[PDB]
């Protein structure tokens, strides 16, 4: 009960972190678990409609916070709903340029390193590397 109450207050902005750190998507993963979104949504159902709407809106905003400011400025120009696709296309285009620049085997090693640092799933990295290769030809 306390965890959900603290999370709701934090998202609402009533209570900030100990060091007043920004309330980013990463910050919650670091305190309220990876499943801060699913458990919070289930908990919110036990609250009036107004609180439910606020929780949904705050969760959506936090998800948008998962990107850097520069990425948001570059890719979120035409709305947030289209941000993910634009970012993915931009990310894919960079992969194509790298492949055409320094071969494929090095790119495969680079993708492995980036996925390792990105905490991406082995499936997502394989899906990404296959897509860029297909885009090349």
């Amino acid at each position: 009960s306390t965890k959900m109450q603290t999370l709701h207050k934090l998202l609402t902005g009533e209570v900030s972190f100990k060091n007043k750190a920004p309330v980013k998507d990463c910050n919650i993963v670091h305190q309220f678990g990876e499943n801060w979104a699913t458990e919070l949504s289930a908990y919110a159902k036990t609250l009036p409609a107004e609180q439910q709407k606020i929780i949904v809106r705050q969760i959506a905003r936090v998800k948008l916070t998962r990107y850097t400011v520069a990425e948001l400025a570059a890719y979120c120009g035409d709305g947030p709903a289209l941000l993910d696709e634009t970012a993915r296309a931009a990310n894919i285009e960079q992969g194509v340029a790298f492949v055409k620049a320094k071969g494929v085997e090095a790119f495969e090693k680079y993708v492995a390193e980036e996925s390792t640092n990105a905490n991406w799933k082995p499936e997502e990295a394989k899906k990404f590397i296959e897509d860029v290769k297909a885009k090349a030809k």
Partner: protein, 48 residues
Amino acid sequence: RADEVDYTNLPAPKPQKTVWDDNIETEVLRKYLDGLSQYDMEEAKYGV
């Protein structure tokens, strides 16, 4: 059933001062490189 955890507590990020290889290029640029290191640490503490 005692206290479990302070969810509003975050371990502050640990700034690490960038170290440059000791070459003549570093000696000539010692002040400039040091300024970059200080800026990086400041950008780490504050966040951006």
